[PDB]
Amino acid sequence: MFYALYFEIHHLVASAALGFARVAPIFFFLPFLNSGVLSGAPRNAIIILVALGVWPHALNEAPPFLSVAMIPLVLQEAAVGVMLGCLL
């Protein structure tokens, strides 16, 4: 099926985008990751790579959240990330 690789790349970037919401706050709190040290073009490139390194589901199948209101979800994930940043 011809377009399947194209869709499979878009599923990847949608998953990475929703992972950034939960990984970036940690990079804000820790003293060796905050923007007093790591800044400019490296910063996003590294955060995204980590988020893809830890996402739990196979990257090549459609993301399950397409049916849901995006804002309540993004705020939920950011709150979780803030809690983890404190505990670490």
Partner 1 sequence: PENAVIGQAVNIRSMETDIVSLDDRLLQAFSGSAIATAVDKQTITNRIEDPNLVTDPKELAISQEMISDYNLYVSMVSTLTRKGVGAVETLLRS
Partner 2 sequence: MGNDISLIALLAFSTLLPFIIASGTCFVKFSIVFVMVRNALGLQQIPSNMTLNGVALLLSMFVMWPIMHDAYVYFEDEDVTFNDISSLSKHVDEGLDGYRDYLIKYSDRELVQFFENAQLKRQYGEETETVKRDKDEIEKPSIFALLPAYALSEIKSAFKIGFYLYLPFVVVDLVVSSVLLALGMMMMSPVTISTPIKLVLFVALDGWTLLSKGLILQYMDIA
Ligand X SMILES: CCCCCCCCCCCC[N+](C)(C)[O-]
Considering CB under 8 A, how many residues would be counted as binding partner 1?
30
For residue 26, which phi and psi values (nearest 5 degrees)?
-60, -45
Compute the distance between CA of residue 5 and CA of residue 23 in angstroms, rounded to an integer.
Answer: 27
> The tokens of 41 are what?
């073009």
E strand or H helix that includes residue 44: helix 42-54
Binding mask 67-86 for ligand 3PH (x = CB under 6 A): --x-----x-----------
- We find the least distance from the C-beta atom of residue 32 to partner 2, in angstroms, to be 16
**Gyration radius of the chain's alpha carbons:** 15
Contact letters for partner 1, residues 15-54 (x by CB under 8 A): --xx-xx--xx--x-----------xx-------------
- Residue 40 interaction partner, one of ligand 3PH, partner 1, partner 2, none, beta carbon < 5-8 Å per kind: partner 1
Shortest Å, Cβ 60 to ligand X: 30
Do 59 and 87 contact (CB within 8 A), yes or no?
Answer: no
